[PDB]
Design a protein around this nucleic acid. Sequence first.
RNA 1: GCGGGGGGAACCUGGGGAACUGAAACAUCUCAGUACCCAGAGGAGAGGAAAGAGAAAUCGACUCCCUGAGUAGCGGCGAG
RNA 2: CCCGUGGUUCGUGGAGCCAUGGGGGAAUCUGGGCGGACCACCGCCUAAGGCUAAGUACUCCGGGUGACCGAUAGCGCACC
RNA 3: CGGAGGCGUAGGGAAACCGAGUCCGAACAGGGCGCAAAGUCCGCGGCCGUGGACCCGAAACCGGGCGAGCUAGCCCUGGCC
RNA 4: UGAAAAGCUAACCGAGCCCGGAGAUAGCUGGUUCUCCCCGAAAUGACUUUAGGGUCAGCCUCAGGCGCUGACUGGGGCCU
RNA 5: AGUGAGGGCGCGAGCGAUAACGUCCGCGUCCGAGCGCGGGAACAACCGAGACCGCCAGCUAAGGCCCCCAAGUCUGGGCUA
RNA 6: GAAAUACCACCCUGGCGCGGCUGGGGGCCUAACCCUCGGAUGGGGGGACAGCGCUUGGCGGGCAGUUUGACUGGGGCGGUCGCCUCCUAAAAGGUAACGGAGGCGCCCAAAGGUCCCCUCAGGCGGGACGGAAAUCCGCCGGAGAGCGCAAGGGUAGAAGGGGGCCUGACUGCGAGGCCUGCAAGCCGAGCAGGGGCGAAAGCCGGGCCUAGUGAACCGGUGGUCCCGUGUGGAAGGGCCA
Lengths: 48, 49, 64
Amino acid sequence: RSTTLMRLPKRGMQGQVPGEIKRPRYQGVNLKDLARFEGEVTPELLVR
Amino acid sequence: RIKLLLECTECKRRNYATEKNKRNTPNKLELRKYCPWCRKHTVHREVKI
Amino acid sequence: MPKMKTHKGAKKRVKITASGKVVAMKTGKRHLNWQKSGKEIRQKGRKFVLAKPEAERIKLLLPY
RNA sequence: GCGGGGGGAACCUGGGGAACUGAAACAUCUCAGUACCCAGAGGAGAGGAAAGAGAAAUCGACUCCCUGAGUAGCGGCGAG
RNA sequence: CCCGUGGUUCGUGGAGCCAUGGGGGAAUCUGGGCGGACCACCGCCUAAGGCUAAGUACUCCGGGUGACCGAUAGCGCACC
RNA sequence: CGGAGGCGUAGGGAAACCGAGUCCGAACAGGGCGCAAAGUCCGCGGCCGUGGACCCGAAACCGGGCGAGCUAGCCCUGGCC
RNA sequence: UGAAAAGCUAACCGAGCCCGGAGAUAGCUGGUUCUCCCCGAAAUGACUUUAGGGUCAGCCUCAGGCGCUGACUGGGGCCU
RNA sequence: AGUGAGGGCGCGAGCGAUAACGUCCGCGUCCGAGCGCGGGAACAACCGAGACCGCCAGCUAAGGCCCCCAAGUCUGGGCUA
RNA sequence: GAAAUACCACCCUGGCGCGGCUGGGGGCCUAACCCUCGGAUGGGGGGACAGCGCUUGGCGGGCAGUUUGACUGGGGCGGUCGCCUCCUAAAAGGUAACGGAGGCGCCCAAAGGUCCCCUCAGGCGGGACGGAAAUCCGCCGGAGAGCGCAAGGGUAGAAGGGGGCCUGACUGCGAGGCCUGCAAGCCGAGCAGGGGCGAAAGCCGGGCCUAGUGAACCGGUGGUCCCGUGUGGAAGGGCCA
């Protein structure tokens, strides 16, 4: 019951611009190092 | 198909607006008016088959 | 073993906010006939009907 | 002077290959390359060193397990 | 490479690669298919021969274990 | 003990993306929010989806075989009226 | 096959019999099992190749929270 | 989670012949699904009445009291025969 | 004269010259192929045909596999199946019935805007071409004539009759409500851009309103200028109209 406007065509290989929601709040509230953390150091980080 | 055929308005190459219309009485005669999103309002014209 | 949404559904609009809801193009009428015209064409935001949109939901649950 | 042939519960490769039921009808579709007829190598064959992957100036035989998403997608884009 | 078809998550599609039934019909490493229908790029691999081990399958047959069965359940079949 | 993962951990959009903001948009007007009000895992259990899924129940369709001492036919060959 | 009615085709072939898909399919009928305790359904709506079926609406039950909000009654507007 | 069809009675319109234990809709009750007791002879839905279980207890509905069967063959005043 | 004339330019209508492309057809062979010979691997008849391989278009029950609706005081044949209006809905609203009735599946380019004016049929009385009924005069009138189209509502304190000027029958949108379980369909102040009718107090996001209507898929066109399966582009494709 309804046309549509979302079409995901004949394929399988998309690009990227990595949208991982991370929070300066978890960070500074209590799990960080106020200057250098980097994606690399975020394991524990609940944003990966 | 009856004296009722559907046309629509387009404006001086800077847009096109729509709406149906007819055929009967003054047939073709088709300037009209209307305003596109071109500029802020603007003539438009109409015609367009 | 895994069910997986009326993929179809997920596809044809059919969208969810993990909050607890979904929507489809207003889809009230539009993008079809319409020797309609204007003001009428005012209906293309988005929409959602409650109650019913459960089946939708659990069919989907797993991805979309 | 050799060889085969003849078997064999199931597994196995290729050969050829179907309606139901679903799609609450049903003709694309579906079950499916599934059931079954066959030929044949085994003790297991199958595949097995890349005109591959994949895009990072990267990997590196083939096979099987977990994951890869049931997403990427295939479609009277419907059952599936 | 033209159409006639198989594969493949592809059911006809902008639909690629391998694969063949018809007609055409060649290149030796400036070679030639492959990433993007296709065109200009870079990149990739080296095709149209050959051999086999090892890790998943299978259960005739043997051994063993069973919040698996007791004679109308268990294999139907515990014994000419 | 094995730490490829999948679920959380903002999301808003067809996307480009932006980002707790956001798409429409030239519109300061609405809808997805923001709002954590943490889930995530193990179990036990009401419960669907696929699998025959309370149980036995049909006309029949399809595959491979089984039979002319079944029966009718036709062939060969004696006999009897 | 068939001096053909739809005949006979291992004792009832209008499309044989055994095994197989398969435990086909079955909105239709049957059948649907210890005790006791609470509540208490509807047997109507809406569109449906549905119409003895079904999706959503109406009524029910168990759990959270609101917690004086309810049928009905008094009274006073403004509706028939 | 279950019914997705049901009937009866009263009133109000259809219809039908203003016929039917007909069928259409609505207000109510109903009966199923409790509606198992009284009851009217006995009778799912007509008047009474809600049965958690006892009583060799008493008051009552409806509707009853010559008898068959609990209860005045009461009293009072008539009118039919 | 519609044109001017020489001789040099290109371009056509029409027929013949020659040349590259390719379409049509008529003749014994011949060696593949077929039948072949008649007692031999050599002869004979046919022979570029049709046999035959593949692709082409088309006849085509002979065959196959499906389907050929629901309602309805049985089935079928008959009716009928979407929407508006009136009755019965019994006075809120709101409900069957093979219950009564009766319309629509158009359009109106200007019946779409606004400013300015006007104001019925019909009764009567008097009148040229009349002449039951035009056209004009004279009175009278809960407005019963009127409003494309059916009914019903409304309603000339005109939505109705006439003139001027004009496009909003605008995009962006809407708060908050009608009804409805679904989706529907429907009502709308006000903010923005932008105009149009008056000088303006303001009306205009189609009509006087209740019927002229159709999901979803699929695909088209006018965008856009979002995506592109290494990158540039592109087949192709996402949202708009």
